[PDB]
Amino acid sequence: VHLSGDEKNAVHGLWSKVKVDEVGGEALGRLLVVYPWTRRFFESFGDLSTADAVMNNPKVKAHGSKVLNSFGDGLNHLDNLKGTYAKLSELHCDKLHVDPENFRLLGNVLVVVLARHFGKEFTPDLQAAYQKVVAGVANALAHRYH
Template identity: 40%
Template structure:
């Protein structure tokens, strides 16, 4: 899973990401809605236009949840248990959407971090976001 080097890279880069939570999270959601329009079905009450305050605010929530995961890299299941329950039992979000959002989030990281988003950082974040998606999908099994 995540190596010590992966965890170090994730934590180092996350300090830069967390400063732009609303921007990065909102952009990741916008990318997901445009690239995978079927994901919009979970947000019928949102204004889904680019730059929407509702999308940006929800993006900030996503980044805040990921911040919690970064702080708890050694125990993601416990750190994300409440969120996993919410998505599985109340919202009934298709777990495939977690992977789709992860892909979009990585694109946002690459765009905004530029040269800092090295292949090693990309690999670490791919593992991390895959682990988060897996934990969020646990309750579906």
């Protein structure tokens, strides 16, 4: 991804304000609520049939958290997303067979959750830097499909 110095400072600065145990679980929960077909990959999580079920689901919360830490990993390695997500690429592509479009959709859900959490601090300029990050994470996880 191509992020300027200002864009790097602004993304890292917003991310240290991110509530680690909250934002990931809200973003996964929201993806599962809004795009009902994504629920097929999370059979073990039990009840995902209502928003109240999804949003009060401890497995959704725990898995969300790990997903948010994986985004953070990418922020630490913006020059080498390919190498960072190489193993997860094989997991999502070769084992689970998640269609790569869903990586973009979840990336955009994270952008929505951040807006929700940060208000006017999540400016048009800052969102535009997270759009670069989120596109890069998606494309790097999709590398196993080319």
